[PDB]
Design a protein around this ligand. Sequence first.
Ligand code: HEM
Ligand code: HEM
Ligand SMILES: C[C@H](O)[C@H](O)[C@H]1CNc2nc(N)[nH]c(=O)c2N1
Ligand SMILES: C[C@H](O)[C@H](O)[C@H]1CNc2nc(N)[nH]c(=O)c2N1
Ligand SMILES: NC(=[NH2+])NCCC[C@H](N)C(=O)O
Ligand SMILES: NC(=[NH2+])NCCC[C@H](N)C(=O)O
Ligand SMILES: [Zn+2]
Lengths: 407, 411
Amino acid sequence: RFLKVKNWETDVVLTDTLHLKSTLETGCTEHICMGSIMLPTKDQLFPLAKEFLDQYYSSIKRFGSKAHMDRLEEVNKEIESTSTYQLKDTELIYGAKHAWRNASRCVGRIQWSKLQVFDARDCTTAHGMFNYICNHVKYATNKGNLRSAITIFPQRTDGKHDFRVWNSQLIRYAGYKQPDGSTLGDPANVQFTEICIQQGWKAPRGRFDVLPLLLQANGNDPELFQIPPELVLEVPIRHPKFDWFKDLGLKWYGLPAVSNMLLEIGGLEFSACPFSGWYMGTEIGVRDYCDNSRYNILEEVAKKMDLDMRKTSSLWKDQALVEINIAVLYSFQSDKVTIVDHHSATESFIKHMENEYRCRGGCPADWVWIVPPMSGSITPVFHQEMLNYRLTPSFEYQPDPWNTHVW
Amino acid sequence: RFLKVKNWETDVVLTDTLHLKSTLETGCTEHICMGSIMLPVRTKDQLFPLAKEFLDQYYSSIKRFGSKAHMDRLEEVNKEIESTSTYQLKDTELIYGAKHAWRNASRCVGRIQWSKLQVFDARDCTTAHGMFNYICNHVKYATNKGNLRSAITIFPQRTDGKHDFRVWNSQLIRYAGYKQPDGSTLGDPANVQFTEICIQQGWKAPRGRFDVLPLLLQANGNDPELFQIPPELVLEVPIRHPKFDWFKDLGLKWYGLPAVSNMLLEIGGLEFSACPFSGWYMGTEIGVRDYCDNSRYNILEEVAKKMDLDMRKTSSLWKDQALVEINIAVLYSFQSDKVTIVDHHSATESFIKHMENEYRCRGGCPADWVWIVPPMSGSITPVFHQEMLNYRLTPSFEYQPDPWNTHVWKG
Ligand code: HEM
Ligand code: HEM
Ligand SMILES: C[C@H](O)[C@H](O)[C@H]1CNc2nc(N)[nH]c(=O)c2N1
Ligand SMILES: C[C@H](O)[C@H](O)[C@H]1CNc2nc(N)[nH]c(=O)c2N1
Ligand SMILES: NC(=[NH2+])NCCC[C@H](N)C(=O)O
Ligand SMILES: NC(=[NH2+])NCCC[C@H](N)C(=O)O
Ligand SMILES: [Zn+2]
């Protein structure tokens, strides 16, 4: 029942009781661990709403109060009457912040309580969605001084009137398959980039074409929109020593804004809930830039450094990797754009974890996602045992809309 | 039931059915994953079924399942168990067992080599001096003047739990660690407790930063005895850098033979509490963990200073830059001295090929992602992008409590 996690670098042992409140499954069993797998009714709703409201009133020190009982009956009546219910603004804010607090794969949760919540539940059309999104982008970007935020559109009703942001992130680059058989731009977005074309977008066919927003409101067909270029902050990447680095012509955007996940609060499902914070260096420098399936730029950079790429044991890939990440961080910092390196971010997560254990009795964490993609063991989280479990409110994965939409 | 795993870099999807032959638990449940947790005398009753399962596996491997030889062996073992409460493995079954324990080790990235293991049968051993002799022979054989050969030495199995054979060292070759009164540590911090035990047992410590520890050996449940491994049998490599001439002046070196000696080997229900095994190093084990862990030699700063990196702020990634150079030095040194070693790129690439082969010929390959992915440059190695399934198959290597915590001293 009571589990303990130890840090093998400090010997610090923490006891976890919070997992005892876990509701959803993990995918693992007593016979098999799937820890490395990426994607492992009124009668149903009231229980979920009750669980949520109970934690909410408990958080505001009014558990078992008349107000608690009142709201709890009001929702029951509303569900029985409308087969669903609406959250109070206070509950919505609490729920979104806690979905982040509960995100086991997020290393920056020390920032969880500082989240700007934009209530877009009054939205009805795709143009309205575009407007809300532009405002979120402008607010969150804040001229480089990034501020975490989330915009919440109308909750699911009958599943045939769902709001959805077809993009995977508010801001991403297009990808096109060239005759050469090679891919131009970001291979990760090749399919989405084609759907935009299939819709009318005039692809400039560059290495970094900021994709258009494909917005779906109330279940209708998605519409394109070009985010005001003036609102998309980008950072040209240059190295603080290698003047030839700028010649690679690489750049990245400052705002990471996941837009394809589903926010679940008190049983309610918000299928369109774009959220953003700020980047951890490795996300761009290691994954976006060096993944073989992404921009895959290691070799190019290696050649420019004149490294011995004849043998893997020369560790040329590793040397180049470091340089590419020093640059990314240097570029963002030079342009005054918020960004955090993997050492600072992991150190903060450890602190957060400790705070969470002594104040909440635990902190669900997915080691596989928390440990940075480079220099793993020189960051504190590598040596930190973690318990992964699912707590709600939560951010969940959901099927891409183009594989479920009925035009 | 079929379970699929996908490699997100190649989209290759594999199907696992081997997990169905898994018996042991993992530590996880449908409500909680313990995938990052380091460490989540039998009776006749539970022993014959374990023997049968193993013998069935053995006879199937040699294409003699159901044969008279198979049936007679099962009968022979059954009689032996009811007669003596235990049983002895035939040499062939011991070899098959040891190789499969390696084949089944989910945390081992070098398993492509599993079928190539020299098994030394030391079940006739009765004393600590006998254990020392066997261990010297293992080290000399395995070292092979730098051309490392994988090997395992298997001492007598557990009987009543009061006559266990144990190698108290965690590895046959390791450096001593000494806690100074000022709170600092001389040598390898990971071995301070064991070093103190050795000193107490009579070892005269030279108190240097790289002193090869003596062997502390326990035979037949008796108190352990100290032995010094012949220096001429301990191969070491001075660490230097191909471009930085000052690197050698850090006074660093390491031993060439990694020989884990504190695990338990379970074969057909039998427990071999003393079963030292060795292969060869993957660079990062030394360059990343042994040298750069804050709790080990912790050399990142001293190296970073010499390279004169901007140690003012972490965003300069000086720790990362130094880490790479140290690992370059480790590989370069071993290669230059002609001592077998594999870099993490080569090792993980081979593991992926091995894993795919296992899925196709065996129906699976249990693997612990947390341990398989190297401690540096994780995502630039293929294993990072490979989904894995972790489950426990026997024969297997298991952890066991340190002997000093359970041993009943006879004095
Ligand atoms: C303040 C800055 C923040 C930092 C530095 C941070 C950092 C990270 C990192 C490095 C990852 C892994 C990304 C990947 O590998 O694809 C991650 C994942 C995630 N973060 Fe955070 N995060 C921040 C803000 C946010 C915000 C504002 C939310 C929600 C309101 C959030 C929710 C999540 C979730 C749900 C995931 C997993 C997404 C997935 O499964 O693909 N994060 N975060
Ligand atoms: C031939 C070269 C070999 C290589 C390159 C290799 C590499 C590795 C590495 C990198 C680890 C992780 C070590 C750590 O993080 O402490 C490991 C673990 C392991 N290997 Fe291998 N290995 C090899 C041979 C062997 C042999 C001969 C056996 C057994 C017959 C074996 C059994 C295991 C086991 C059981 C573990 C886990 C140990 C633990 O839990 O502490 N390995 N191996
Ligand atoms: C197969 C494996 O689960 C996959 O490559 C995971 C590993 N860890 C990760 N960690 C983070 N932060 N992000 C990812 O996309 C991944 N991918
Ligand atoms: C807490 C966490 O499980 C621990 O630090 C693990 C992570 N991965 C590892 N991987 C290897 N190969 N060796 C280790 O000792 C560890 N330690
Ligand atoms: N820090 C964040 N909020 N990240 C969200 C995911 C961004 C993704 N890892 C990327 O590199 O584009
Ligand atoms: N390749 C091996 N057989 N390794 C065994 C473990 C060695 C241990 N990681 C060390 O650095 O000493
Ligand atoms: Zn698990």
